[PDB]
């Protein structure tokens, strides 16, 4: 007994601010601004020069400002009944999915701020060499002066692997570690002086370098209404929930909320340059879609095409596909294919390269029965 | 420049309101509907 | 102005109970005359609800 579902892994919140100021309705706008100290210019002039005038420099403050923005919530209803009939199994029912999926909806929350933050350029780490790519990493970061402590760095399930194939580690010789850390275990040590943290939320192919003072969350515990019957403060890995089950009456309703006020702030500097983080994403230059050659289902059937890198990443929802047979066989966008007429068709993928240049295609048969 | 922050404060500055007298001067009485019996004047 | 004998001018006052509903907190009872305190949660809308009545 007992086939639980599989479910993913907080991680990403143990690594971020959480919470570095406590008040923000306060102020104006529940925004609060942070002063970042200024710096002074110098300035040079020859002796014995016949202008004894001087130039005044100049120290402006500028500063940066954190706004809670967003509420995650779970809403839910009780079927039809409130003590034995839905909650059966008090504390193990209901209310573990619910606190998992905000758990998990505060993960995606942090993943997007990551993600969507602008990195400007791409490094391209490639499979053949991943520690120059490191050490490209590690130039980024030496080059805005950021400082060298405080530096983590997360990585998808695709960085891994594509570390553990690195023929650096693997070796042993070439690592210099006698117990073979990359071949005996599937887990690698810190490389690069930042150490290596598994997180599948983030993209597999993409891995994201950041210093301590990179982003800001902010997560606010919202209090328990007067107004209702019930209420909780069940924490969630760190960050507390308001949850609340009042009996909205109306059409039976027994519907209950898990909230938490969540806030995002991304540091940028004085003009605006986001060079406190780096990002890396895998060259991928060979695809081919899973799986071979394949009839269909049926002369009316359908079925959704999957295509993978030669890393070993999913990329059907950047992938393309073309029908050359298209009265024979019609293909969707995201490459659900459909069998209209029985016969022999092709369908060809195409993938834009991270690298650039011209898009790598491949083209897979079909004999719709 | 220099940026500053903003203050908001409170030093005995109350809005005028009313005061509570009538209140109490009253003849109040607690709790449908409630009836008072009146008592009869005879005549001689 | 009005110069009356305490007999006369009189008031009732009945201080309803509260609903099913209610979740209530402590009394205040403003001058002299009791009053309670509701306070409901609707979970339709985004608001909380606070009446004080007699």
Not at chain 1, 139 to 147: F, I, L
Not at chain 1, 234 to 252: C, E, I, K, T
Not at chain 1, 255 to 284: C, H, I, M, P, Y
């Amino acid at each position: 007994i007992g086939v639980k579902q599989l479910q993913r892994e907080i991680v990403l919140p143990g690594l971020v601010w959480t919470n570095p100021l406590t008040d923000f309705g306060g102020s104006k706008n529940d925004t609060i601004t942070v002063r970042v100290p200024a710096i002074t210019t110098a300035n040079r002039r020859d002796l014995r020069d016949p202008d004894r005038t001087v130039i005044a420099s100049e120290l402006v403050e500028h500063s940066f400002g954190v706004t809670l923005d967003k509420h995650v919530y779970a809403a839910l209803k009780f079927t039809d009944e409130q003590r034995t009939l839905d909650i059966r199994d008090y504390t193990k029912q209901v209310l573990m999915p619910q606190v998992s999926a905000v758990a998990y909806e505060l993960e995606d929350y942090i993943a997007e701020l990551i993600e969507g933050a602008p990195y400007e350029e791409t490094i391209l780490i490639d499979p053949a060499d991943t520690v120059p790519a490191f050490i490209t990493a590690d130039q980024r970061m030496g080059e805005a002066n950021v400082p060298t402590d405080s530096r983590r760095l997360v990585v998808g399930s695709a960085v891994a692997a594509a570390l553990a194939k690195d023929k650096q580690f693997r070796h042993a010789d070439w690592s210099g570690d006698q117990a073979n850390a990359a071949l005996r275990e599937a887990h690698v040590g810190r490389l690069a002086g930042m150490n290596v943290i598994r997180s599948n939320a983030i993209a597999p192919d993409k891995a994201y370098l950041w210093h301590r003072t990179a982003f800001i969350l902010a997560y606010r515990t919202p209090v328990v209404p007067e107004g209702a019957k019930a209420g909780a403060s069940f924490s969630a890995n760190g960050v507390a929930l308001r949850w609340l089950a009042d009996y909205d009456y109306s059409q039976l309703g027994d519907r209950t909320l898990l909230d938490v006020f969540t806030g995002r702030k991304v540091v940028t500097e004085v003009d605006g340059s986001f060079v406190r983080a780096v990002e890396l994403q895998l060259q991928a230059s060979s695809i081919t879609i899973v799986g071979g050659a394949f009839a269909l289902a049926t002369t009316t059937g359908t079925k959704q095409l999957k295509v993978r890198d030669d890393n070993g990443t999913d990329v059907t929802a950047r992938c393309t596909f073309a029908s050359s047979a298209g009265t024979k066989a019609t293909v969707s966008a995201a490459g659900l294919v459909t069998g209209v007429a029985a016969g022999t068709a092709d369908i060809t993928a195409s993938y834009v390269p991270p690298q650039g240049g011209t898009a790598k295609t491949a083209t897979v048969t079909v004999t719709v029965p | 420049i220099f940026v500053k922050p903003e203050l908001v404060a409170e030093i005995g500055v109350k809005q005028l309101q009313r005061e509570i007298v009538l209140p109490g001067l009253v003849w109040t009485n607690p709790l449908d509907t409630i009836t008072v019996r009146v008592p009869a004047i005879t005549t001689a």
